[PDB]
Amino acid sequence: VVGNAAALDVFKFLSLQYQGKNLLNWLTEDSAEALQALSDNAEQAREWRQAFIGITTVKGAPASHSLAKQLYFPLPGSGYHLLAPLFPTSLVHHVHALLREARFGDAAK
RNA sequence: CUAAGAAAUUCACGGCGGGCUUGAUGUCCGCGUCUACCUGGUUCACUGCCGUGUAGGCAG
Numbered sequence: 001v002v003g004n005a006a007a008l009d010v011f012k013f014l015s016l017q018y019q020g021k022n023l024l025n026w027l028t029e030d031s032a033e034a035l036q037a038l039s040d041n042a043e044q045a046r047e048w049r050q051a052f053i054g055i056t057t058v059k060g061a062p063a064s065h066s067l068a069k070q071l072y073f074p075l076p077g078s079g080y081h082l083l084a085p086l087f088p089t090s091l092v093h094h095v096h097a098l099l100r101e102a103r104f105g106d107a108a109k
Numbered sequence: 110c111u112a113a114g115a116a117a118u119u120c121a122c123g124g125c126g127g128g129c130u131u132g133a134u135g136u137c138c139g140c141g142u143c144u145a146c147c148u149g150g151u152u153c154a155c156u157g158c159c160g161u162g163u164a165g166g167c168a169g
Binding site for chain 2: 066068069070071072074080083084085087
């Protein structure tokens with residue numbers, strides 16, 4: 001979850017719903033798991049279901065930056081495409097958790 | 110047209126003190142090397158000889 005650095009504390013309260021229950025997908029859609037133990041009115045339930053959709057959906061406009069890479073690639077019989085690569089946060093999290101049980105851990109030690 | 114394109118790491122210092130490596134010893138033993146012959150290399154391409162000048166009798 002990339003975003004405002006001094007605003008990533010409410011993300012823990014929004015994402016604790018995938019801990020304990022199975023109601024992480026109950027806050028935005030399927031608010032029957034957010035009406036009985038939420039204890040808010042229709043304005044509060046609607047405002048929560050509207051504000052919780054702005055995480056997984058788009059946050060801003062699709063763009064790039066001058067400090068990005070944006071390589072060129074020659075085409076087979078044409079000009080070029082600009083290739084702007086990105087950092088695989090999901091893949092590096094998966095390989096990082098994969099290697100922390102392979103270098104140390106219970107069985108590997 | 111390259112994870113393209115850009116960049117000052119700076120500075121300082123006590124490692125220090127001590128000390129028994131000891132003792133012993135059999136290297137023994139044997140043997141056929143064998144035959145063969147022409148330097149006056151020019152031990153300076155000439156020493157030393159009547160004129161230091163280009164012709165000459167000598168130890169040849």
